[PDB]
């Protein structure tokens, strides 16, 4: 004669609503439609107009961003190239900042 006991661990896994932006499992069909609203405008670089999942991800990018330099902080006005904006900052703001190396490149 004798006796004893035992145990075990649960587990959940089934149809889940993941985000088509960061692939994050939601809590419901509603969290998906909404999570997409914030996960779309969470982090938008005012330079290249990007869209990240978190606000930090952008903060870092802005530092290594290329459009940044092409962004007239003065009047927060971005441009297509440096030569183009330069004229806007040299003719209007008249800054005449340090222009880049000239080249035969196409314009």
Residue 91 C-beta: closest distance to Zn ion, Å? 10
Asked if 57 is part of the footprint of Zn ion (rule: CB under 5 A), the reply reads no
22 binds Zn ion (CB under 5 A): yes
Among 16, 30, 75, 90, binds Zn ion (CB under 5 A): 75
CA dihedral 26, 28, 33, 36 (to 10 degrees): -10
Q: Is the dihedral of CA 98, 100, 101, 106 positive or negative?
A: negative
> Could you say which of 72, 78, 79, 83 contacts Zn ion (CB under 5 A)?
72
Told to check if 21 binds Zn ion by CB under 5 A, we report yes
What's the residue count for the chain? 107
């Amino acid at each position: 004669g004798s006796s004893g006991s035992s145990g075990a661990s649960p587990v959940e896994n089934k149809e889940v609503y993941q985000c088509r932006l960061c692939n994050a499992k939601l809590s419901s069909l509603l969290e998906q439609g909404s999570h997409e609203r914030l996960c779309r405008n969470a982090a938008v670089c005012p330079y290249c107009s990007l869209r990240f999942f978190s606000p930090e991800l952008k903060q870092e990018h802005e530092s290594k961003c290329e459009y940044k330099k092409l962004t007239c902080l003065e009047c927060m006005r971005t441009f297509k190239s440096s030569f183009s904006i330069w004229r806007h900052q040299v003719e209007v703001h008249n800054q005449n900042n340090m222009a880049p190396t000239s080249g035969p490149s196409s314009g």
